[PDB]
Amino acid sequence: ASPRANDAPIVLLHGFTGWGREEMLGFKYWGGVRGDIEQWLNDNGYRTYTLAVGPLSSNWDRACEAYAQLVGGTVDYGAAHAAKHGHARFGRTYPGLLPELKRGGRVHIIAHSQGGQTARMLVSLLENGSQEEREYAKEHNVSLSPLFEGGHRFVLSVTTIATPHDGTTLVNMVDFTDRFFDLQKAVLEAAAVASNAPYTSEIYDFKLDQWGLRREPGESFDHYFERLKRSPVWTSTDTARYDLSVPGAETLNRWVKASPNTYYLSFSTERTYRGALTGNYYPELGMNAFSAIVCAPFLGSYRNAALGIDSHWLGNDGIVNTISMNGPKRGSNDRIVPYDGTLKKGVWNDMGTYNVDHLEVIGVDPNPSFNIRAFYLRLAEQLASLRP
Numbered sequence: 512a513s514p515r516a517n518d519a520p521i522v523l524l525h526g527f528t529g530w531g532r533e534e535m536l537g538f539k540y541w542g543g544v545r546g547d548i549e550q551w552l553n554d555n556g557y558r559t560y561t562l563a564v565g566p567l568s569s570n571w572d573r574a575c576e577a578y579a580q581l582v583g584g585t586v587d588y589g590a591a592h593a594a595k596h597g598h599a600r601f602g603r604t605y606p607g608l609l610p611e612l613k614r615g616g617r618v619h620i621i622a623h624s625q626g627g628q629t630a631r632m633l634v635s636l637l638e639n640g641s642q643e644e645r646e647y648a649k650e651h652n653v654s655l656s657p658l659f660e661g662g663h664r665f666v667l668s669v670t671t672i673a674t675p676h677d678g679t680t681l682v683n684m685v686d687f688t689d690r691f692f693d694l695q696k697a698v699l700e701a702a703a704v705a706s707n708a709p710y711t712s713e714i715y716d717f718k719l720d721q722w723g724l725r726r727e728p729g730e731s732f733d734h735y736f737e738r739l740k741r742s743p744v745w746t747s748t749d750t751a752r753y754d755l756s757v758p759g760a761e762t763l764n765r766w767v768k769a770s771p772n773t774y775y776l777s778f779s780t781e782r783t784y785r786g787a788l789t790g791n792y793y794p795e796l797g798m799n800a801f802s803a804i805v806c807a808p809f810l811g812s813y814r815n816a817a818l819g820i821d822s823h824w825l826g827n828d829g830i831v832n833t834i835s836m837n838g839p840k841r842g843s844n845d846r847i848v849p850y851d852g853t854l855k856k857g858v859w860n861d862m863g864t865y866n867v868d869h870l871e872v873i874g875v876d877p878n879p880s881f882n883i884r885a886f887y888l889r890l891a892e893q894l895a896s897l898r899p
């Protein structure tokens with residue numbers, strides 16, 4: 512007897528990896544080899560859509576891209592921001608998935624991994640806009656996107672799954688630059704295997720129009736990734752790379768605060784066991800191969816006393832430190848409350864820690880012990896019970 516109190520639609524938002532439903536030959540980021548999560552939700556009475564923003568781009572850019580995809584229009588990164596980092600101010604044009612948001616409509620956002628930071632930033636911007644963009648618009652007499660005006664609050668809830676709210680120490684790996692792109696390649700091969708196709712036939716658009724970056728005809732991904740490593744999308748502070756780091760996440764937390772008008776839910780993940788003598792953390796059986804061999808070992812043993820990255824930071828889901836996921840803590844004043852049966856707004860409702868890794872939670876990597884269908888159907892039911 513679920514007391515559904517709202518019929519607000521749901522939009523899915525990926526992390527530093529992710530593509531649209533028309534990409535990767537149909538292999539879904541949200542569902543992977545387990546199925547199509549969006550389809551399951553729609554079939555069960557929950558109108559759901561999928562967003563696709565720049566995977567390697569800054570959370571700010573993604574938020575601007577997300578805004579346009581929701582209400583329609585040309586992406587506007589902000590005159591001040593664009594002049595500050597040296598990339599185009601305008602991007603792609605979208606028809607808009609939910610134009611009714613500009614007229615009283617509300618929406619639920621479910622985000623995975625880095626997508627959780629993006630969702631939080633979208634809310635902050637919608638509610639307060641941006642002074643820097645406002646003040647700059649005056650001085651130079653240029654148009655201003657409504658996103659930076661503030662005063663728009665059509666987001667009802669934000670749910671984050673395995674989000675590095677306080678960053679991830681993976682960024683500190685000595686060869687992180689090459690390892691990060693090997694991860695991108697690992698996902699391409701996983702999709703390619705699932706579809707019985709050569710990974711060279713995959714379609715994966717990184718949406719780097721603002722930087723003038725695009726894979727050239729005939730150019731392989733391997734060659735494209737090499738160009739990316741030396742580009743602003745990897746060497747500037749306006750990148751996912753920077754926002755993923757512990758200090759970048761903290762900088763993010765200083766201004767991106769929880770709105771008192773929206774419900775925040777967070778899900779933590781873990782797939783490692785503790786070593787009795789060493790005290791370090793190791794990958795459990797079943798963790799996707801790339802993480803188990805390349806990432807988890809480092810995540811489960813890297814410490815940094817100067818920054819308080821201690822033994823409580825070693826548990827992880829193969830990509831992000833478990834302690835970073837339940838809510839913003841570093842440089843933040845947001846309140847985190849353990850789920851006690853009732854969801855509260857303006858605070859982070861810690862929904863618990865689940866025994867699944869970073870990719871198993873979205874279905875890209877198998878795990879028969881994880882009833883992924885029930886997990887998401889139960890989440891949708893909870894979001895549908897929230898009163899506006």
Ligand SMILES: [Ca+2]
Pocket residue numbers: 797798799871876877878
């Ligand atoms: Ca697995």
Ligand SMILES: [Zn+2]
Pocket residue numbers: 569571572588592596598749
């Ligand atoms: Zn930017």
